[PDB]
Amino acid sequence: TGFKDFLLKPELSRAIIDCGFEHPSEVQQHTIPQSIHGTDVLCQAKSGLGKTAVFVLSTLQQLDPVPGEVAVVVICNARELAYQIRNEYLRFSKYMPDVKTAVFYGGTPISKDAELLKNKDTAPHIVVATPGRLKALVREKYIDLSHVKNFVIDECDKVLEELDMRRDVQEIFRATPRDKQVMMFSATLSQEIQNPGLQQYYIKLEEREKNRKLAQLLDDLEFNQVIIFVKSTTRANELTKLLNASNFPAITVHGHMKQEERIARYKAFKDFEKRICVSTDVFGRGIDIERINLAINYDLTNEADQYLHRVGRAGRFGTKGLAISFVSSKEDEEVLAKIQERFDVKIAEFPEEGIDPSTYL
Amino acid sequence: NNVWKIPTGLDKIEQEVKKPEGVYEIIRQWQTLRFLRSRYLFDFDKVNEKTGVD
Amino acid sequence: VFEYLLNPLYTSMTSSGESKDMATALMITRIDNGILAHKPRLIHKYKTHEPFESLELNSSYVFYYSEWNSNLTPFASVNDLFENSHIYLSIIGPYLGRIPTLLSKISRIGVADIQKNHGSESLHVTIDKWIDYVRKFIFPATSLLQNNPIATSEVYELMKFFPFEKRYFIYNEMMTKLSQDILPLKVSFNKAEREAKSILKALSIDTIAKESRRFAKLISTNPLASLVPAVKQIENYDKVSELVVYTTKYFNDFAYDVLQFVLLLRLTYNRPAVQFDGVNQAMWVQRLSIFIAGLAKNCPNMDISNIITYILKTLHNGNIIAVSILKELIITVGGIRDLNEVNMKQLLMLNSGSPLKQYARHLIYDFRDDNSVISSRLTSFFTDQSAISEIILLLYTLNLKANTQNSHYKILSTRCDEMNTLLWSFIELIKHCLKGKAFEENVLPFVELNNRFHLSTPWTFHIWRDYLDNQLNSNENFSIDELIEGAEFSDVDLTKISKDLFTTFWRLSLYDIHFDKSLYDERKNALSKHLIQNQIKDILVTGISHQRAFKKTSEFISEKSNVWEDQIKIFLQNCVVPRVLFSPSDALFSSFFIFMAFR
Amino acid sequence: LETELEEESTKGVENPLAMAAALS
Amino acid sequence: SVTSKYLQSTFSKGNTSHIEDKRFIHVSSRSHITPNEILSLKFHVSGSSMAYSRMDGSLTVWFIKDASFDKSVEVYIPDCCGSDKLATDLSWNPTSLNQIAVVSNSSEISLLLINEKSLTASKLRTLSLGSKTKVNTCLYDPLGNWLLAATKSEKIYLFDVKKDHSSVCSLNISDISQEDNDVVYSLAWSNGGSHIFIGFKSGYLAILKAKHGILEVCTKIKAHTGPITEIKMDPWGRNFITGSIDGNCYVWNMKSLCCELIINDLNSAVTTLDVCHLGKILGICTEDEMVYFYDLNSGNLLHSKSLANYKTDPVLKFYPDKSWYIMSGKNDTLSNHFVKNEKNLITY
């Protein structure tokens, strides 16, 4: 309950506590105390350090709910990110019943957005949106921003570099009261854009023995979850079909596929619904999954940086894990030789007798 | 069998404590203070981040 | 041949002959000329070379040599059953499991034979003799079965009559000496173990619908060799614990007893308790304690009595696993959240009339009210063998020994405070579940508490003030200084201080010293189906009672203040400083009583 | 029979589900 | 292997007819909705009548006179047993050829004699009991000698059907169960009314004696670990089959009362089961929308199918006078099955 040092509302404190937040990161403790007073903020931080929570907690602090009055407007770049920001507003407003939140993005009938804005049961005090749709609503007077007190722009760099996006955000900005709180947040603010423990092993073998070898390894090793890295989409989909045929629940994610199913299977496996997932380097960076304890590199990459990015999916935040790789060609051994010189790590050959299970848990 | 050979009864939990009085010759000061908080509280100005002034 | 030998002895007991007159077939009914007509079915009899009779859809087959049973004489008394078991069963060996029906027949014979003389004095003789028999002939057999729960259910229905010491003897011997050193048993155990691990690798939130049934069958049939891999896998993996506690809903009493056995096994296996690094506790105690709490919460036929005897016993030596299991049991099953972080308004509501208090507790994320039944069950487990007073005294006198250890202060303060909060929460549970006369029966009355064991006065009053206030308010016969008479009050030094002031300070509370009347109105206005049962029966009746209580207490304090530096010194020394360092409510109350009680 | 049974018990045998039922 | 080929032929392109009921033509018109239900469906003993009750309240009865329901008359009737109340169980009274007992989760048991010349179902009599009592299951001794009515808790009544349904006896369920909050889930009669088999929810199974009109507790065995769904009896009278929700299906020997055969391929809960009039094939309808057909003598699977998410709650019943079986279809519509050239298995 570190947010209790923030001196905020108690119901908001409970809504944060039930969200698992216990100790604020550096950027939260450095920005929230001053943003609570209504001052403009321009924030640059490393991605995934809880930059949304800063302004979410700020706007949930400064708001006094007025019926039918929109004071808080957040503008983002995508529809799925808009859905995520409204979900964050919802998980932050569990213990605040009078406040209402809404999201606006393309692909939906504008008349439905209008009627939900006229409805007292859905009249929102917090609106997260894409600049184009909310522009089409203000310019048609479908939404009233004559009382806006809080204006948040996430990923402001792309908002201001793209011409349509900056024009839309400025049309939304000029229809708001000039004496408002203003906040911009982005992980990238270049100079050009009011008083602001991991175990490493390898297998050197030939291709035709891979399919049976994993069928043995995935049989003997004791694991929570397993990830399978491949270099191609066809081989990955084939291996997943065969593995699911092998009484082993497995999912597959890679390119050449519609984004909807990718998000769907990604979220599904995140929730511990199946125990085996296979993917190419599409998830080589950025992914955060805790329960992955055993990784199998079916095919090695071309450069050492990509291999370290792969192994980074295991041992999250300095935790314990196990990694085992396949070597079947000359360049595989070449990259295996180069990784040790760059990363000062002895990737020993995997012994036949097996490793002690407690050495990776 | 061993953990079921331990004697359990009201007669054994008595373990009588030590009387508050402490005779006169940074954890030791902490323990002595915790024990003396009840008897002689007002004679506490003498501590002053030093050895117990008797 | 053995089953034919034993059948007539078996029918004489567990009498099914009176119930034999229900094996008849339905008559063929047909409507002819607009009237019903019944006829019997017609079958014919054929003779074949196959030994087992059958009925293939129109005709019945029988073994031809119809006098094969001429040379054999069935049993007449259970003694003959022993005498011929020693010949036929010692030959069939561990393979008896290939015919489940024999297990059921012998076990029902045993149950009826034990029930026949429940009254007589010689029952322990028959119990010992059947113990030996089940040890030597039946249990090795039932260890061989394959996904057949009901047979094990019968064998355990017989086993239920023994002292649990003997059941643990048989189970442990079967585990250690007879799994090895016997071939078919070893084969079956290895097959079951490999199958259990194979299933355990494939448990998911999505596949539970069938994996749960399969695991339930496999654990119910052959537990004491298929449970240990599961116990380890939940000993050091995160979500398998919740999955197992979900799937306990399905297996029978045998799996329950064996599960409790292996739990005591793991809890007693030789290994280090603290982590290798420093004074931090290891990373399995926590997951195992969570598992045990989930068991006590979900499946209510578990009978974890022996685990509670483990707690009550091993607390004497200060085992960290005992304290941990107790903490997780109290916090998960009971629902008793601590009072570390409480805003002043919640802290105020937390001691008021009933509905305001209930709203406060549901706001602080405390669920003690909804868990009344299971909390009562657990306190009933504690009630037997009279563990309550022993446990309270143990927790208290343990925190002192924890105070006298040597380590870094950064861990000493935290340990002492953690023990203090645990004791407070335990007493909140006890006062919640034991009321009326059961409390005064099993909670070691006041004067003994304070004169024999020398508890510090604040804890004494923290236990007894509610009951004393209740006996004082309604039954106006008795009076304070009489219902608490004889107490030595050891550290108090009652010289140079009015015992009236002493007992008037410690007797009271906050609920009886401060009437806000604003929170009542706020709740009443925010609460405006049947209109929520008419505003919770016009919650305001509690406010009326509260006004009456405030008035009576203020009337008291009037005359008391008419009654009353040395006193000004000792008062702070032994009355307000000890009271304030307690939970917050004691501090707020010392504050309020400092005013409104003096000139 | 004794030796074969004891070996197949202690060591055990991997039942091929999809083993070697494909390549590439 | 003759039975496997017979069942395969019963699942063929032809040899199948849709039972043309109100719901059938309703779906035909609205497809070429929320499916109400089929509360229960129970034949006459002589195999020449059928009755069932949807959730709307209307109970249909057919007078079988043809294979594909060509010349079969149909006495449709509106929501009987009150306008607010709907039927939940019915028994066909093996004594006569027309009477029917119906219960509607209320304190009133309705005896109606269905007529076939007209379409009139005329209420013949109503039986009543204590005001709080809410019975929901009625049964008839297969000889038409006793009638049984049961509540979800704390009431069991037995009437003597011969002497104008004079109330013979009653019993409190708490005397039978002796456990914590048990609710009787399924009842069944023995072949020739001598004993009543009761399956509670806590798992127990009880055998009551009802010889001379005085109920009594004979025995209670801890059969299953979950609620017992169905209890069926073999027509030859040698074993009785128990199916549970924990995924087990056992067959108990009748003379000795001990488990003899177990179905092990099952991995899901059981919603219903039935055994042919020859005591040869056993049909299990599990909870994953799938049916199985096992062999009683050996215990090995001999045919499987898949409901494929059509009419989630299925029903199965084998004719009492031929080897045909009525099975649910796509949207709460019944689907007969036959071979059109084999009245019985023996003829095959």
Side-chain angles (χ1 to χ4, degrees), chain A residues 2 4 6-13 15-18 20-22 24-25 27-35 37-46 48-86 89-91 93-197 199-201 203-216 218-240 242-299 301-312 314-316 318-361, chain B residues 2-4 6-10 13 20 22 27 30-38 40-42 44 52, chain C residues 1-15 17 19 22-26 28 34-49 51-52 54-55 57-70 72-79 81-82 84-91 93-115 117 119 122-124 126-127 129-145 147-156 158-164 166-170 172 174-176 178-179 182-202 204-205 208-209 212-230 232-237 240-241 243-252 254-268 270-275 278 281-282 284-296 298-316 318 320-327 329-336 339 344-351 353 355 357-362 366-368 371-389 391-400 402-403 409 411-427 429-436 438-439 444-447 449-450 453-468 470 472 486-487 489 497-498 501-511 513-515 520 526 539 541-543 546 549-550 553-554 556 564 570-578 580-582 584-585 587-589 591-593 595-598, chain D residues 1-3 5 10 12-16 18 20-24, chain E residues 3-4 6-9 11 14 16-18 23-27 29 31 35 38 40-49 51-54 57 59-64 67 69 73-78 82 86-88 90 92-94 100-104 109 111-115 121 124-130 135-140 142-151 156-157 159 161 165 170-171 173 185-186 188-193 195 197-200 202-210 213-215 218-229 231 233-243 245 247-254 256-259 261-263 266 269-270 272-286 290-297 299-304 308 314-316 318-320 324-329 334 336-339 345 347-348:
Chain A
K4 279 270 179 217
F6 268 123
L7 311 192
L8 262 69
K9 280 154 202 86
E11 284 285 276
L12 213 64
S13 196
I16 308 304
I17 290 280
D18 298 298
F21 302 139
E22 271 315 280
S25 279
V27 299
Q28 269 95 320
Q29 201 281 295
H30 300 157
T31 307
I32 299 194
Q34 298 66 40
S35 198
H37 322 306
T39 79
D40 294 0
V41 162
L42 321 181
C43 164
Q44 210 178 331
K46 168 172 310 311
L49 276 294
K51 43 192 290 204
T52 316
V54 174
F55 82 95
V56 160
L57 203 53
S58 171
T59 178
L60 272 291
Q61 196 185 159
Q62 319 175 249
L63 275 166
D64 187 349
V66 194
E69 189 256 318
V70 192
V72 174
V73 193
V74 193
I75 286 295
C76 53
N77 44 33
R79 43 194 41 73
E80 69 265 40
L81 280 185
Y83 202 110
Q84 198 287 338
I85 309 305
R86 202 199 83 265
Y89 266 120
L90 203 53
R91 57 132 295 284
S93 315
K94 321 209 171 82
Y95 286 99
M96 291 279 81
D98 182 20
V99 73
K100 327 273 210 205
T101 173
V103 63
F104 284 146
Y105 40 74
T108 43
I110 299 185
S111 314
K112 194 181 141 92
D113 311 291
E115 57 89 31
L116 64 86
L117 292 197
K118 323 293 201 253
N119 177 17
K120 177 44 60 183
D121 319 311
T122 67
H125 207 139
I126 314 186
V127 174
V128 288
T130 77
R133 266 282 305 120
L134 178 80
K135 194 183 55 143
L137 288 202
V138 189
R139 283 291 262 141
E140 291 213 308
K141 263 303 161 193
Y142 280 28
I143 180 64
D144 283 17
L145 320 174
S146 75
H147 213 86
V148 163
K149 311 300 173 53
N150 207 274
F151 213 78
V152 189
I153 307 309
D154 52 313
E155 200 69 90
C156 201
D157 49 334
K158 179 273 200 174
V159 176
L160 199 62
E161 288 140 359
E162 212 275 350
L163 176 47
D164 178 14
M165 302 275 147
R166 71 161 264 217
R167 299 327 305 132
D168 301 0
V169 77
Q170 283 305 355
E171 305 320 323
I172 308 285
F173 210 100
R174 293 302 180 262
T176 48
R178 293 315 306 117
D179 182 48
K180 48 164 171 163
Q181 307 133 21
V182 195
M183 275 78 59
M184 321 302 191
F185 308 112
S186 172
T188 60
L189 285 67
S190 86
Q191 293 103 30
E192 311 79 60
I193 306 303
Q194 55 255 39
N195 207 307
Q199 264 290 9
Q200 323 175 331
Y201 303 78
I203 314 166
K204 300 70 161 181
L205 205 43
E206 165 186 51
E207 260 176 339
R208 68 158 312 106
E209 304 99 292
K210 289 147 176 212
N211 73 325
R212 70 96 204 155
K213 189 50 141 41
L214 62 88
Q216 214 77 350
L218 255 61
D219 172 57
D220 254 11
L221 291 203
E222 311 292 320
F223 58 105
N224 257 17
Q225 311 283 65
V226 283
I227 60 183
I228 299 303
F229 293 114
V230 203
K231 59 207 291 173
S232 88
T233 79
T234 167
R235 297 161 40 89
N237 187 295
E238 176 255 320
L239 198 40
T240 41
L242 274 292
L243 203 42
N244 206 337
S246 326
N247 189 68
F248 277 1
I251 325 165
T252 163
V253 197
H254 51 69
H256 187 218
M257 318 163 97
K258 162 201 60 204
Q259 190 61 28
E260 276 269 280
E261 74 92 26
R262 296 177 49 188
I263 314 164
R265 297 172 169 174
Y266 134 70
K267 174 42 60 182
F269 176 85
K270 293 323 159 292
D271 192 19
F272 201 71
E273 285 255 0
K274 328 287 214 194
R275 316 182 96 268
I276 309 197
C277 85
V278 188
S279 82
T280 76
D281 289 329
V282 286
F283 291 142
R285 79 284 169 269
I287 50 162
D288 174 286
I289 312 91
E290 175 51 79
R291 290 186 172 97
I292 312 286
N293 79 297
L294 165 61
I296 286 191
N297 313 317
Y298 200 65
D299 311 316
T301 171
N302 292 176
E303 321 89 350
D305 61 347
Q306 205 295 300
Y307 168 88
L308 64 85
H309 299 135
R310 283 186 164 187
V311 77
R316 209 81 57 175
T319 44
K320 210 160 193 94
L322 167 63
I324 182 54
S325 298
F326 270 147
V327 169
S328 279
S329 166
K330 303 324 301 191
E331 66 283 353
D332 211 316
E333 329 167 18
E334 187 280 342
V335 192
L336 167 144
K338 316 314 304 182
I339 62 184
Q340 37 204 309
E341 265 53 41
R342 313 163 71 260
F343 205 21
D344 182 10
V345 278
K346 165 159 193 52
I347 170 153
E349 178 270 351
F350 185 75
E352 173 269 300
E353 204 62 3
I355 302 280
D356 171 85
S358 277
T359 44
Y360 50 71
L361 53 84
Chain B
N2 268 335
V3 323
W4 274 66
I6 300 195
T8 161
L10 238 322
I13 327 182
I27 290 300
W30 203 73
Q31 315 287 46
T32 309
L33 253 54
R34 286 291 297 268
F35 222 60
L36 264 16
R37 223 183 36 197
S38 271
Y40 329 109
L41 188 62
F42 277 147
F44 258 11
Chain C
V1 7
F2 193 70
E3 168 196 319
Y4 162 75
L5 258 157
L6 151 107
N7 208 306
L9 174 57
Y10 159 79
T11 294
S12 167
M13 315 213 262
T14 92
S15 158
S19 315
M22 55 180 168
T24 37
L26 308 185
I28 286 198
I35 313 100
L36 283 192
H38 293 323
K39 305 279 195 177
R41 29 225 339 182
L42 317 150
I43 80 179
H44 19 60
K45 187 102 55 169
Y46 292 164
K47 326 189 82 183
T48 64
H49 284 269
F52 299 107
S54 145
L55 219 160
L57 182 142
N58 194 33
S59 48
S60 89
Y61 296 121
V62 278
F63 194 49
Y64 72 91
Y65 189 33
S66 56
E67 48 269 33
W68 65 263
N69 54 55
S70 146
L72 321 172
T73 79
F75 303 100
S77 47
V78 54
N79 254 348
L81 174 56
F82 278 88
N84 299 13
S85 322
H86 276 156
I87 277 180
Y88 294 64
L89 285 170
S90 199
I91 287 310
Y95 282 95
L96 186 62
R98 294 222 189 282
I99 13 154
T101 320
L102 269 206
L103 291 172
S104 315
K105 274 177 179 39
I106 311 183
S107 317
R108 296 178 163 180
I109 287 206
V111 176
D113 171 44
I114 298 173
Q115 275 181 341
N117 40 93
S122 70
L123 188 147
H124 101 290
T126 120
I127 273 300
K129 135 183 154 202
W130 271 96
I131 269 172
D132 268 303
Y133 187 96
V134 152
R135 148 177 210 180
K136 192 191 169 195
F137 291 158
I138 292 163
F139 199 63
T142 181
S143 157
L144 195 140
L145 284 167
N147 68 11
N148 183 313
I150 179 54
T152 54
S153 198
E154 305 278 351
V155 161
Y156 190 78
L158 159 60
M159 255 163 162
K160 259 168 189 161
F161 288 86
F162 305 147
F164 80 114
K166 260 30 170 172
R167 302 202 303 286
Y168 286 173
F169 197 8
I170 300 169
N172 152 78
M174 175 83 209
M175 214 198 197
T176 276
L178 291 204
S179 146
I182 277 200
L183 190 73
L185 277 185
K186 169 182 302 179
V187 177
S188 180
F189 263 12
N190 272 350
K191 170 192 305 300
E193 205 177 288
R194 166 186 263 117
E195 223 279 358
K197 254 135 80 155
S198 153
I199 281 188
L200 248 196
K201 288 170 186 306
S204 74
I205 314 295
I208 219 78
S212 82
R213 311 276 159 73
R214 275 173 57 208
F215 206 69
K217 281 169 172 178
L218 175 55
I219 297 284
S220 198
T221 275
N222 190 14
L224 79 172
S226 155
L227 265 185
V228 193
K232 286 181 301 204
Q233 211 107 350
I234 68 185
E235 182 183 357
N236 52 48
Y237 278 19
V240 287
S241 173
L243 302 185
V244 157
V245 189
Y246 164 66
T247 189
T248 82
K249 90 163 52 172
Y250 279 145
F251 34 68
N252 53 12
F254 186 36
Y256 282 165
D257 203 347
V258 155
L259 171 53
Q260 167 179 340
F261 183 57
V262 308
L263 274 202
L264 261 71
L265 224 213
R266 305 314 286 186
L267 284 182
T268 32
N270 188 354
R271 56 150 89 111
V274 319
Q275 204 155 16
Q281 110 196 160
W284 55 274
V285 154
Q286 177 52 224
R287 261 164 301 244
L288 206 51
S289 196
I290 287 178
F291 179 48
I292 285 177
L295 277 202
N298 284 22
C299 40
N301 352 15
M302 165 63 48
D303 196 348
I304 37 184
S305 164
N306 283 305
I307 293 193
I308 288 149
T309 302
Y310 170 43
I311 280 168
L312 158 66
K313 206 93 47 172
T314 193
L315 262 180
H316 274 273
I320 312 105
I321 323 194
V323 184
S324 160
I325 301 177
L326 195 49
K327 176 183 318 171
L329 260 183
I330 272 176
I331 282 185
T332 289
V333 152
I336 315 282
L339 259 207
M344 272 279 293
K345 192 184 186 183
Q346 293 162 337
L347 206 173
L348 232 298
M349 274 198 279
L350 261 194
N351 37 321
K357 223 193 281 195
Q358 260 94 135
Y359 180 66
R361 290 212 282 258
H362 256 279
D366 184 324
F367 301 90
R368 140 180 33 203
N371 283 331
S372 198
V373 49
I374 47 196
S375 176
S376 197
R377 165 166 181 263
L378 161 67
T379 321
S380 63
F381 277 157
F382 264 104
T383 285
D384 316 353
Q385 79 241 70
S386 155
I388 292 284
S389 182
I391 271 220
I392 278 164
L393 260 297
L394 272 170
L395 286 163
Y396 173 91
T397 47
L398 178 148
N399 96 344
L400 286 205
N403 162 54
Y409 24 69
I411 205 65
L412 213 48
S413 98
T414 301
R415 197 41 177 190
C416 164
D417 164 273
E418 216 309 306
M419 205 51 62
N420 188 355
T421 279
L422 161 75
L423 191 32
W424 172 92
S425 152
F426 182 53
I427 274 199
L429 175 116
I430 259 313
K431 287 202 309 194
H432 167 51
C433 260
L434 259 45
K435 42 189 53 175
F439 190 100
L444 200 56
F446 193 116
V447 194
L449 261 188
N450 211 299
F453 299 164
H454 305 145
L455 245 68
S456 62
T457 111
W459 279 111
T460 305
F461 273 113
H462 187 282
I463 318 180
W464 274 126
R465 85 167 24 114
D466 205 306
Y467 198 71
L468 288 197
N470 178 88
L472 236 315
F489 266 166
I497 174 59
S498 144
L501 169 51
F502 208 141
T503 41
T504 308
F505 192 173
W506 286 97
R507 204 184 97 236
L508 285 153
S509 161
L510 198 65
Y511 167 95
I513 214 76
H514 162 40
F515 191 174
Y520 294 92
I539 63 178
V541 47
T542 74
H546 202 181
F550 188 17
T553 40
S554 316
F556 202 119
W564 33 240
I570 281 191
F571 187 73
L572 288 154
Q573 159 72 289
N574 302 136
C575 302
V576 58
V577 150
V580 163
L581 302 182
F582 245 54
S585 291
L588 254 58
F589 153 72
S591 157
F592 279 2
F593 180 95
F595 303 146
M596 89 161 280
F598 283 86
Chain D
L1 242 194
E2 165 146 355
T3 279
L5 195 53
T10 297
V13 281
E14 194 78 342
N15 40 69
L23 282 196
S24 64
Chain E
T3 39
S4 159
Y6 171 81
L7 279 209
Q8 282 191 26
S9 91
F11 269 126
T16 287
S17 164
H18 291 290
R23 170 64 65 107
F24 173 59
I25 70 181
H26 191 84
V27 174
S29 94
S31 63
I38 321 193
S40 56
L41 154 72
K42 279 186 186 168
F43 283 82
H44 194 45
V45 197
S46 47
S48 101
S49 148
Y52 56 96
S53 96
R54 335 287 308 239
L59 61 154
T60 302
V61 14
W62 294 69
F63 285 63
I64 317 274
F69 297 126
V73 317
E74 162 185 3
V75 181
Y76 193 112
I77 135 173
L86 81 169
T88 90
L90 61 156
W92 251 105
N93 182 255
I100 279 202
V102 55
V103 187
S104 37
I109 292 184
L111 305 187
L112 12 152
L113 59 103
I114 294 181
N115 177 31
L124 164 68
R125 192 176 180 152
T126 78
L127 276 169
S128 277
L129 342 94
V135 317
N136 59 11
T137 62
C138 75
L139 281 164
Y140 261 116
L143 301 186
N145 249 323
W146 306 107
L147 197 156
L148 186 83
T151 51
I156 281 197
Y157 309 92
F159 311 106
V161 57
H165 297 266
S170 48
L171 199 66
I173 271 225
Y185 254 74
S186 34
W189 274 97
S190 32
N191 305 302
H195 296 249
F197 282 73
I198 288 187
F200 295 90
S202 33
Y204 265 41
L205 172 139
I207 287 106
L208 303 176
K209 184 159 61 186
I214 325 293
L215 279 315
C218 203
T219 179
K220 34 175 45 255
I221 65 182
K222 167 62 141 164
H224 267 109
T225 52
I228 298 177
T229 282
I231 286 187
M233 328 273 295
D234 176 75
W236 285 113
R238 49 206 215 284
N239 56 62
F240 67 90
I241 310 182
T242 279
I245 206 136
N248 275 314
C249 164
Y250 301 156
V251 17
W252 304 71
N253 183 94
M254 191 75 142
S256 58
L257 291 175
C258 274
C259 159
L261 171 66
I262 294 175
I263 312 301
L266 273 197
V270 192
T272 172
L273 44 91
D274 186 17
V275 17
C276 163
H277 72 110
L278 277 183
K280 165 70 156 180
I281 119 189
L282 159 69
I284 287 184
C285 307
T286 178
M290 177 159 292
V291 289
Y292 302 105
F293 297 107
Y294 286 97
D295 191 341
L296 254 190
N297 299 322
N300 50 333
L301 156 66
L302 80 103
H303 189 54
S304 158
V315 299
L316 194 43
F318 286 101
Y319 272 51
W324 300 332
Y325 59 101
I326 286 185
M327 177 172 60
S328 155
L334 307 182
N336 192 340
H337 293 269
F338 44 33
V339 195
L345 256 158
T347 311
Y348 205 145

